[PDB]
Design a protein around this ligand. Sequence first.
Ligand code: HG
Length: 127
Amino acid sequence: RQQFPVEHVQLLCINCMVAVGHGSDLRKVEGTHHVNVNPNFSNYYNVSRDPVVFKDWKPGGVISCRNCGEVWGLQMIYKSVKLPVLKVRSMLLETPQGRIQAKKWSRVPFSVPDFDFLQHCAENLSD
Ligand SMILES: [Hg+2]
């Protein structure tokens, strides 16, 4: 399989395929959970409190495309902070090669850095 710089892969909604994110905004939490840490991201998803029943994070609401209503994943919270956790199969990866839908995050044509909580406090004033 190929390999691109994350900067070169854009996120689209598997369904409506609107440009919704950047692969460069992806982070790994607890190794596995893939969040997006770009604040401007919330402009693309609605949240809905369908709580349901991950050791340092409590799940928030279910997350879905503002534009077609596709479910993308669910919120996750830790020490008062809320991040959108993305399901791989809900994303269309727009590589310079074209568009590929994956079924495991561990198989995306780029590398996703671990999430840095401390440094995420570049966002202290808010929340
Ligand atoms: Hg959509």
